[model samples]
Target: PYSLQVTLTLVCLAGLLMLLTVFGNVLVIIAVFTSRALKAPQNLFLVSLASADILVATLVIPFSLANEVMGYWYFGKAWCEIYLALDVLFCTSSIVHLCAISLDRYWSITQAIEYNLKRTPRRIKAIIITVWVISAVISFPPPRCEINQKWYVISSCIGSFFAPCLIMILVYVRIYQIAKRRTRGRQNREKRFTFVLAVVIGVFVVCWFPFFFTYTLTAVGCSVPRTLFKFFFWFGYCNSSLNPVIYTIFNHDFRRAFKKILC
Candidate 1:
């Protein structure tokens, strides 16, 4: 249907995205493990987030790439569901992971002494497990929704995205208020932290909103332009790649760690 040059460009660009996603996330994981400064309890959340990105690159993107390039479901039948399940699982879980990060940051700062005492390794790992379980619950049963995907589409969109979106927004607002009032100690650093948090949430929303918008639209029996559809969908997928870049740009410790490893 198109020139060989066009197809070649798509394949090359998509492959580059997949590779960069893996490399960046792997850098996050290794940096956290190897760097003494990054060994704190909070950094595990960063590692947890990176692992989600890694899975998206390894499990989700390759199959998606084949489909995009070939113009049909290459694996068919069984793999369709597997791919769809993986698609929902990691994507929602990462948002929930982001939700957890905001809460963790809030508690660590606002409830400083008490939360620090409470934030043991065992406890944090349990919270991580809880995040995965919530995602599994949201993703697994919805496979049944193919019969009337319209309802499934809207509901899942609300449950997976909008709900967590509200929570993160509120959490950050409170954190911002606290940062504003408590201007005595480390105010500059807290302001910088808020800036980083703002950018992450901003990028998350921008990348995801359009994809879900069209995702819901198509399920509601509207015909969307194919190229437009592909653009937004892959744009959401690209958010996984952008996440590690956020850490690299904003967090000096992580940036330093990244450099040492790549150096």
Candidate 2:
């Protein structure tokens, strides 16, 4: 259960995450929308991404904090289903959006000349809409699943977690190679872009893969270890904190926006 030290740690982690997520994604939204130099179709995807992240921070995290501190859900059955859906929908959208970002970066880097024509504004808009719709569709089922009290809610809902993550990891595995080749010996600015892109994608994989791996295995009729599940869940949450850190550190456009707004 919740000891003082563990409570303090979780609070610290959650509070820090709340700040970074709000600040970072807000800054991204402002920068992409406000800056003439930075606005582009791909950047539009970034804006869509920032918005999705904001929804998670706002919609999911507060109740999550309460659940953590109180050590049980006080929201009861109806709200629990809503929370479950929000959790699945927003989290799935975040993953898909990140994958879209990485795939765009990989395409842009490895094929910049053609990308100008191929990845046009209209196409990017379509793709962004497609991302959210598909994510919503994929993650929609679990919350609607008739409440089966015989099994743990989480266990009965296992399939929801498995599918999208597998797709994201595999997509990025290929993205890494494409990024590596294109980014080789690139100068500071290019290196920074590649680094942020790679790290964002890499963290997505590194943090979530272990947990989902075990979860998927167990869901599909194998015994999964509890420690592995904890490892993955917390690590995936760890990624929520990292996104803003990377943006603040490596993304010049966002840095300027922060300075403009707050400095």
User: Largest lDDT belongs to which candidate?
Assistant: 1
TM-score per model over all chains? 0.88, 0.76
The superposed Cα distance between candidate 1 and the true structure at residue 199, in angstroms, equals: 1.4
In the order shown, the candidates' Cα RMSDs to the true structure are 3.3, 4.7
Clashes of each: 0, 0
Task: Tell me the lDDT of candidate 1.
Answer: 0.80
**Model 1 residue 196 distance off true place after TM-score fit, in angstroms:** 2.6
| lDDT, residue 257, model 1 | 78
Candidate 2 deviant stretches above 4 angstroms:
4-9, 142-198, 221-228, 245-248
User: Which candidate comes out best when scored by TM-score?
Assistant: 1
Measured on C-alpha atoms, candidate 2 has an lDDT of 0.67
lDDT of 2 by residue, 18-55 (tens): 77778778877777778776777777877777787778
Clashing pairs in 1: none
lDDT tens string, model 1, 180-219? 6766435567767678768967897888877777777787
Which portions of model 1 show Cα errors greater than 4 Å? 142-148, 184-194, 219-224
